[PDB]
Amino acid sequence: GIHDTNKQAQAENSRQRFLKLIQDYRIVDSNYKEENKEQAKRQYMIIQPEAT
Amino acid sequence: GARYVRQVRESDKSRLVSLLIHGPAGSGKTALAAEIALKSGFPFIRLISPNELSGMSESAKIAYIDNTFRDAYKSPLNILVIDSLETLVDWVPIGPRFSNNILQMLKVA
Numbered sequence: 753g754i755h756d757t758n759k760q761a762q763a764e765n766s767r768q769r770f771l772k773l774i775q776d777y778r779i780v781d782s783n784y785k786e787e788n789k790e791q792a793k794r795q796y797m798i799i800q801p802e803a804t
Numbered sequence: 805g806a807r808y809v810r811q812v813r814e815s816d817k818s819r820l821v822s823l824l825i826h827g828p829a830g831s832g833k834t835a836l837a838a839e840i841a842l843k844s845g846f847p848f849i850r851l852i853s854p855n856e857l858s859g860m861s862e863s864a865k866i867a868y869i870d871n872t873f874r875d876a877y878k879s880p881l882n883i884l885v886i887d888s889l890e891t892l893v894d895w896v897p898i899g900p901r902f903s904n905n906i907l908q909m910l911k912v913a
């Protein structure tokens with residue numbers, strides 16, 4: 753699209769949308785990590801089944 | 805403390821007295837214990853602390869503490885200081901995990 757302003761516009765729109773997609777992915781990942789932490793806290797912060 | 809010391813000194817029937825010193829961390833407990841022990845003025849004084857017991861093995865610790873209790877039954881007036889019980893017995897709450905044999909040995913001693 754370097755020589756046609758319309759093609760450049762199209763490319764930039766694709767870029768924006770793909771960037772939004774990436775952001776969404778990042779968000780999901782972060783949230784899930786944070787949740788996995790709280791569950792891993794839940795399970796072991798208490799007296800445990802009888803010894804090995 | 806001094807009162808208790810005189811009590812053990814004089815009485816003929818109370819031949820064994822045990823004390824416990826508890827409080828928040830950093831309250832300065834061992835200093836008090838040592839000061840009482842020193843100012844008592846008995847022939848025989850001894851100290852069991854975690855600080856000595858590093859790096860050695862389980863059988864070795866039980867042996868050592870047994871020896872120390874053996875040695876104190878000469879000399880008809882005696883004093884022993886046991887520092888920081890919980891770390892001698894390997895406490896960590898996560899399991900919780902700790903060594904039961906040592907605990908029993910002290911409980912019987």
Ligand SMILES: Nc1ncnc2c1ncn2[C@@H]1O[C@H](COP(=O)(O)OP(=O)(O)OP(=O)(O)O)[C@@H](O)[C@H]1O
Pocket residue numbers: 828829830831832833834835836888
């Ligand atoms: N009145 C007092 N009571 C307690 N400690 C005192 C007092 N006056 C001074 N100290 C200071 O207490 C310090 C020793 O405290 P000590 O070793 O008993 O601490 P601790 O809280 O038992 O330790 P830890 O938490 O490591 O087991 C010394 O530096 C001593 O100067």
